[PDB]
Structure 1
């Protein structure tokens, strides 16, 4: 699944005016997300912390 964000199609959206990105950050432009919603969607977690949590 760490290969999937290098392989999936989430970062190829449909419109010609939207070349790449996420749908939530595209929503955040016109429909500004709350401060919780800005930092909830982003996630940069190392593998070893998940491993030791499991």
Structure 2
């Protein structure tokens, strides 16, 4: 990768290094998206009732 090369001379912390190499999954991301959608819908309905 390019930023993993840039990590050497342009010195990176722990957080940028771990952010470049993140171990996530399709399921995790999809669940997060679904949760956000549900929350949005909920807030919308609540304000509508209000």
TM-score w.r.t. the length of structure 1 is 0.48
Bigger relative contact order (CA 8 A; separation at least 6): 2
**Alpha-carbon separation, structure 1, partners of 2:30 and 2:16:** 26
What's the CA shift for 1:26? 0.5
Find runs of 4+ consecutive structure 1 residues off by over 6 angstroms: none
- Higher normalized helix content (fraction of residues): 2
Which structure has the larger Rg over C-alpha atoms? Answer: 2
> Number of matched residues?
33
CA RMSD of aligned residues (A): 1.3
In structure 2, the gaps of 5 or more residues are 34-50
